[PDB]
Design a protein around this ligand. Structure first.
Ligand SMILES: [Ca+2]
Ligand SMILES: [Ca+2]
Ligand SMILES: [Ca+2]
Ligand SMILES: [Ca+2]
Lengths: 19, 145
């Protein structure tokens, strides 16, 4: 699968949430 | 909708759902965000939840998490915010993600994997052959399947 893409996604989400 | 996509949603959800009870609390959301270097307040965390808390019970369940991922990902990631994410992985900030640094963020997040699996990921993204992942390589990896 896409291990790095999934983790990247979580990091990008968290960055996005702290708006 | 494939079983693999579902498995990926589950994996992501379970990184937040630390106690495995099927809801993400402000405590749990905050735990993940702290591990990634941020320091949101309890009220800020609640505001995050409220955006997607369709049933109004104050916490994030699986479909509400899917909604959060649907919205708050593929906003349109700009250069600066991609660099922010890279900076999370490049712990020491020398411009190169090592296998050890990759291992560290993943472990901090709540992922569990062997050094073997980390090496594999690195080697996959390492276009120029130095055994590490620089910014360009990092960006390029996210465009692959
Ligand atoms: Ca929970
Ligand atoms: Ca809810
Ligand atoms: Ca580094
Ligand atoms: Ca490299």
């Amino acid at each position: 699968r896409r291990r790095w893409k999934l983790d990247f996604s979580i990091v990008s989400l968290c960055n996005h949430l702290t708006r | 909708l494939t079983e693999e996509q579902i498995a990926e949603f589950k994996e992501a959800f379970s990184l937040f759902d630390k106690d495995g009870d099927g809801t993400i609390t402000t405590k749990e959301l905050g735990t993940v965000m702290r591990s990634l270097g941020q320091n949101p307040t309890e009220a800020e965390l609640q505001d995050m939840i409220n955006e997607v808390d369709a049933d109004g019970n104050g916490t994030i369940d699986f479909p509400e998490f899917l909604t959060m991922m649907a919205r708050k990902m593929k906003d349109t990631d700009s250069e600066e915010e991609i660099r922010e994410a890279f900076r999370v992985f490049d712990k020491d900030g020398n411009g190169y993600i090592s296998a050890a640094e990759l291992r560290h963020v993943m472990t901090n997040l709540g992922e569990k994997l062997t050094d073997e699996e980390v090496d594999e990921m690195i080697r996959e993204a390492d276009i120029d052959g130095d055994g590490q992942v620089n910014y360009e390589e990092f960006v390029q990896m996210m465009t692959a399947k």
